[PDB]
Symmetry: D2
């Protein structure tokens, strides 16, 4: 035999321009629409304040964005195709049943805003597209799903083989879309800029 | 931006001939020694029968194999170097402190023997070298550590990108050594041959 | 001292007489039936041999036991109601959408048979009903979902107090049903009784 | 009905008055001290700003609080004994080898401060002592180690019954110590009181 060391059980991170598919979205219309919706949403504004929610999110107040706003139906038609390419990369056996949009929402993170580590319970693919970035810094940090199984293990060198690293930081530009499997833990670092960081996040189910 | 999909958080499986390092072991002496030890070990033989242990294991009866048997000290001197190469691949930050042998034991799996899925609690590297194989079939199956986080996810196609597969089966030859991180779940498929499958398994701590 | 130690995030295991729900089911007939169907099932017997599976499962060979065998349709009427009571205990938000049977199979574990550690991927509630239990005969043995998080911890003394143990064994009587959440790992230790341990296992999805 | 639902594999959370162990420690002096050390700690203040950390931790800047500040040496004498009582409850096999302090740090969380979800990698017992708690002020909130195993399950109604919840909030009083196993995920929700929430957090290893 020959000595071999093999990579197994790898997580895949998908990172593309939104414009890789689906109809075109105007970035100016895109940002302005996010703002116009958030400003008309008294109920979501109050829930954020009561719940101690760092930014604005539309998640508790608005459940039907693509029904109500052509630009959001347009967005979901791109996202649909991005999720299809990704389900393909991930080798999902879908039968006759594509992944479909379960939830979709706006975030507006002002300066000083942060979102603590979490997963999206009961979804298959989750993701975020970036509507306005600030335009440093990292906007997403993904944590190794095996981290809590690694308690007895030495910490790892922060070396140049990215597949061995324990956290992965992502620094998207406006227009980019990120996708991942929903069980993956992820955090959103503090907005250090004075301008808002606007993004749209979403869950796809099977 | 360019569309990219990246592999993250990968498990590494190390698979080498034992003879890749350390002093040479005679395979005939190696097998015969395993047998001679197991046959003199009344206490381990009785514990196996009482505990409903599929084969013979020396694990409960003999804690000091390398102290008692030059061939086992020889083996540990090879294994020491195999574990060093692997800790290097895994990018462990070890300070001034190499991984050292914690436990080491013989298994003799007769026809019809199987070992159910398990991990090795409280170790860093675990592994097995193969002393006598039978010489079909698969002797080790490794399970994706993320399997139980994948309950809502479609099953995956059994395709040709091994890093996306949910189980990995390993079919070693005599003389091979396998190593993995101890939190990784692994099972030993039934010995379908009539001859015993003899192996030596071990845990390294930090 | 005002020191309090609270228990949180406990895994629930449901245990009831089968007869508390559903049509009357005679245990002597029930045993007789499982033996009878397993005898005719050459496919099953052969897949078992081929796949190195100890004893005897119908899981690969036969797929609609409830529709074919009236006594399995009665069993399933009972399971539904047991499952519903468990979901009530858990207390899942079900809409008006009751969990339904997804698979059900017969196991016959002879003297010396073991069934290795495993979960039931992609199910919500999993469970077993006990058909013939020699003359003890092997427990179902449950494993702590947290075990792989525990690698840095010291070992726990079988401080029993069956709350602080890594595994939990159950010796059910004939006629009992056990249910658990499908992510919960479990095995069947070696049947050391001369007679067969017969059981029927199943999964429920939403 | 003879139906039983048993609780297994429960996570333990220890809660006691700090004063039940160790030298006397005055809470007014204790508060005064934490404020005082945090004020001098420009390094800490600056790392915080730089690293987008809300409020104020000493964890990056100061590394031997017990040796430098007598009141922290007294605190630690107390923690040792609290930890030992918890290890006794757990009941780890410790040899004659008591778990010892590995790190300890001051947190000061102002109005609007949050501390994101996280574990304490590579520790055995982790915990917090409460120093100034406005005028409620944020709970410590604990997350079910099993959450990522639960992706196929329905959502659970805040059926409280603080046994079946995915998170568990604690509102401790000034002078309380809380301890948990270091793999347990937890966060601090937004401090909504105008005044600072001061606490001291620590890890113990074997
Ligand atoms: Fe998220
Ligand atoms: Fe093993
Ligand atoms: Fe099972
Ligand atoms: Fe903490």
């Amino acid at each position: 035999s020959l000595a071999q060391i093999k990579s197994l059980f790898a997580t895949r991170l998908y990172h593309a321009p939104l414009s890789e598919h689906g109809p075109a979205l105007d970035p100016a219309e895109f940002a302005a629409s996010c703002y116009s919706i958030a400003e008309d949403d008294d109920a979501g504004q109050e829930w954020c304040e009561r719940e101690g929610y760092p930014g604005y999110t539309s998640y508790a107040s608005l459940t039907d964005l693509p029904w109500r706003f052509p630009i959001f139906a347009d967005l979901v038609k791109s996202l649909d195709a991005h999720v299809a390419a990704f389900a393909e990369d991930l080798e999902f056996e879908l039968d006759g049943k594509a992944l479909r949009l379960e939830d979709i929402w706006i975030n507006i993170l002002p300066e000083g805003g942060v979102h603590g580590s979490h997963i999206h319970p009961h979804s298959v693919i989750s993701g975020t597209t970036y509507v306005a970035m600030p335009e440093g810094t990292s906007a997403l940090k993904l944590e190794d799903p095996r981290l809590p199984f690694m308690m007895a293990a030495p910490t790892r060198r922060k070396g140049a083989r990215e597949e061995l690293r324990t956290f992965r930081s992502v620094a998207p530009k406006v227009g980019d879309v990120l996708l991942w499997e929903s069980w993956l833990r992820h955090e959103v670092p503090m907005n250090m800029a004075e301008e808002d960081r606007i993004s749209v996040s979403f869950n796809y189910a099977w």
